[PDB]
């Protein structure tokens, strides 16, 4: 278990697995692309045109790298076969407990808040499951129906909605429906009051007479039959502070010197005078090609 990348595989696995990081030319989409600066964070991978390099396809003048993912639990089928990165899921190598049940679990979910609170996956399921039933998900203008950190920290909204694939399929199907329902409500739209039909309708700005697809003509403001005129009528801070994502040394494979991890990248070059060895922080051995795929950063 030396994987540091977790993806969602729709086909054929239909579940969440470890993932392999790949890189190709952003211009010609050929797998032969050499990177100049190793990715140190998820932003290097997700944001577009952030890392330059060289394309090995003859004649191609592309400069930027395109990072994608593959499921590591099934053999690739075709060049189009890709998986969705679940960037918030990390390896709890720091042995950080959960904010809720104080368990040292692995892997964990780390929210992107300035404070980086950590939850185990089971609590995350319960966190989403509860807040879904109580219509507590927020209807974000950019990210859609989503959730922030349970502590409610600034800029902690989940952006990759496929993190909710951690949920039961019934909940995920419910997640999308509720997402659509409150999208309508937030957009000034309306839902057909009929029992047999709750169609989502985006009415005009100032529209009283609404006629659904089912033929029912109702008032947009009061959601009753159409008429004219006026419408008649628990987080513990002790746990949270300890369950915080935001000293440690490892010996060099070529000279046994004490080394510390600088950034998030796992590709490390021994700073020692006599030894300029390329080695991996995770494997505690030489920097291999699969190190890029399995755990380039994190």
């Amino acid at each position: 278990n030396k994987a540091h990348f977790f993806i969602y595989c729709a086909n054929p696995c239909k579940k969440i697995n470890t993932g392999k990081l790949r890189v190709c030319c952003s211009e010609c989409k050929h797998g032969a692309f050499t990177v100049d600066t190793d990715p140190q964070s998820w932003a290097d991978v997700l944001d577009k045109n952030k890392i330059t390099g060289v394309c090995n396809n003859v004649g191609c003048e592309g400069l930027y790298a395109k990072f994608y993912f593959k499921c590591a639990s099934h053999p690739s089928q075709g060049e189009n076969d890709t998986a969705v990165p679940l960037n918030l899921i990390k390896r709890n190598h720091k042995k950080i407990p959960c904010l809720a049940c104080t368990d040292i679990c692995d892997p964990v979910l780390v929210f992107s808040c300035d404070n980086r609170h950590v939850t185990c996956l089971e609590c995350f399921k319960n966190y989403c499951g509860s807040r879904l039933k109580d219509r507590q998900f927020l209807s974000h203008p950019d990210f859609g129906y989503t959730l922030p950190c349970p502590a409610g920290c600034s800029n902690s909204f989940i952006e990759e909605v496929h993190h909710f694939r951690l949920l039961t399929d019934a909940q995920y199907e419910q997640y999308h429906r509720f997402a659509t329902e409150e999208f309508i409500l937030q957009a000034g739209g309306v839902l057909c009051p009929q029992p047999g039909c709750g169609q989502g309708i985006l009415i005009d700005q100032n529209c009283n007479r609404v006629q659904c697809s089912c033929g029912y003509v109702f008032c947009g403001k009061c959601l009753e039959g159409f008429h004219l005129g006026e419408c008649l009528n628990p987080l513990d801070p002790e746990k949270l502070e300890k369950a915080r994502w935001d000293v440690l040394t490892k010996p060099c494979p070529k000279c046994r010197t004490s080394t510390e991890r600088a950034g998030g990248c796992m590709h490390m070059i021994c700073t020692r005078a006599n030894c300029g060895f390329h080695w991996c922080w995770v494997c505690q051995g030489p920097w291999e090609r699969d190190c890029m795929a399995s755990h380039w950063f994190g």
Partner: protein, 76 residues
Amino acid sequence: MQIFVKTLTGKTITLEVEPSDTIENVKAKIQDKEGIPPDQQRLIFAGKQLEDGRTLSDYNIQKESTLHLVLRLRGX
């Protein structure tokens, strides 16, 4: 791949589609199956309204996932 298009009514449509297909192309597939004008169609995934210019792959929409169809009625 095939995706599902579901309304809040409960009516479900299966669409054979490609990841590089624009939402506009998806809408046409719905009109070809339900007669609904694309001008009245609006697809929503995870609470986000998909724009015709962007494609399915841009929204990381997977196989056997469901889009939601919501009506745009004017004049109310």
